[PDB]
Amino acid sequence: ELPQMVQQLNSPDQQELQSALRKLSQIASGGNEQIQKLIEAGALSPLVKLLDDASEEVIQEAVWAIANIASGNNEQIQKLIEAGALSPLVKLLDDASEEVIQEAVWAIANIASGNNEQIQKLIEAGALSPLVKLLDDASEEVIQEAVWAIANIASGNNEQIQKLIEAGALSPLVKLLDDASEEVIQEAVWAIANIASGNNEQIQKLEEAGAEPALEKLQSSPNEEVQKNAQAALEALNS
């Protein structure tokens, strides 16, 4: 029963709370129809409120649940935004533990896979500066999630690409085109290719960041997905 589970999300007993959270998390990972049941049961507002509580154990499980709800359709992401999820998720990128940060980045990356109005709400919540910061100081595992989030934001409109440039994304993205991991290069090259499809001013900023020789190195890559994006970005730089 979902209504009792939702009620248990504001229970003083930490075991009853954690048990209700685990039950909710399992439902949230079961596809869009299961996510819809959570929305209809009014689970999103109490879930989001758990991002501010004292226990890092509770926050970790709540972030996991939110990240899975964010894998839902755009209307489901919209309900998560309406429940006030973005400001507390962005806040976790600054003061929470590395384990909590990784899950918050995954939630943000999933929200960024939504429509341009949803990417706009992420930008307004202040996601760009902490995401760009993660591209160089965080662990290889967190870098992979951060680049994917940025690649999703870069798929937005030219005004959103401009906000990424202003947040200082180009220098670390160019550096990640020569990263050891192919999965990192894949997202880095897609982000660059998206920025390359922007306006002439944005193309000039890519050239100034040294994208051209970095992209020329990748047009000989064994990974076919990397090769296509590199070629596209290079054709955009030479117009």
Partner: peptide, 6 residues
């Protein structure tokens, strides 16, 4: 071209 992926 198309910017988004899914």
């Amino acid at each position: 071209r198309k910017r988004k992926r899914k």
